[PDB]
Amino acid sequence: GSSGSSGKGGVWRNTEDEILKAAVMKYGKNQWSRIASLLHRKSAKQCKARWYEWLDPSIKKTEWSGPSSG
């Protein structure tokens, strides 16, 4: 919408995601605060949200299998 950092689920660019996804994998899903520093206009809340939002394993993703019986 307008210039700033805070907001409702701030947008995200491939780059930001690349750095985040990695950092989280290196430092882990605990140093969310430190990771935020890496990205400009980002905070633990965003890093944690954006992550669990789309970037997360728990998410119900397909496992090399589509149409399965039962």
From Swiss-Prot:
It comes from Homo sapiens. It comes from the Eukaryota. DNA-binding protein involved in cell cycle control. May act as a transcription activator. Plays a role in pre-mRNA splicing as core component of precatalytic, catalytic and postcatalytic spliceosomal complexes. Component of the PRP19-CDC5L complex that forms an integral part of the spliceosome and is required for activating pre-mRNA splicing. The PRP19-CDC5L complex may also play a role in the response to DNA damage (DDR). As a component of the minor spliceosome, involved in the splicing of U12-type introns in pre-mRNAs. Residues 32-55 bind DNA. Phosphorylated on serine and threonine residues. Has no effect on subcellular location nor on homodimerization. Phosphorylated in vitro by CDK2. Phosphorylation enhances interaction with PPP1R8. Ubiquitously expressed in both fetal and adult tissues. Transmembrane segments: none annotated. Homodimer. Interacts with DAPK3. Component of the precatalytic, catalytic and postcatalytic spliceosome complexes. Part of a spliceosomal 'core' complex consisting of CDC5L, PLRG1, SPF27, CCAP1, CCAP3 and CCAP6. Interacts with PLRG1, Lodestar/TTF2, and NIPP1/PPP1R8. Component of the minor spliceosome, which splices U12-type introns. Within this complex, interacts with SCNM1. Component of the PRP19-CDC5L splicing complex composed of a core complex comprising a homotetramer of PRPF19, CDC5L, PLRG1 and BCAS2, and at least three less stably associated proteins CTNNBL1, CWC15 and HSPA8. Residues 8-57 form the HTH myb-type domain. Changing residue 54 to G: Abolishes DNA-binding. The gene is CDC5L. Changing residue 32 to G: Abolishes DNA-binding. It is found in: Nucleus; Nucleus speckle; Cytoplasm. This is Cell division cycle 5-like protein. It is linked to A chromosomal aberration involving CDC5L is found in multicystic renal dysplasia. Translocation t(6;19)(p21;q13.1) with USF2. Belongs to the CEF1 family.
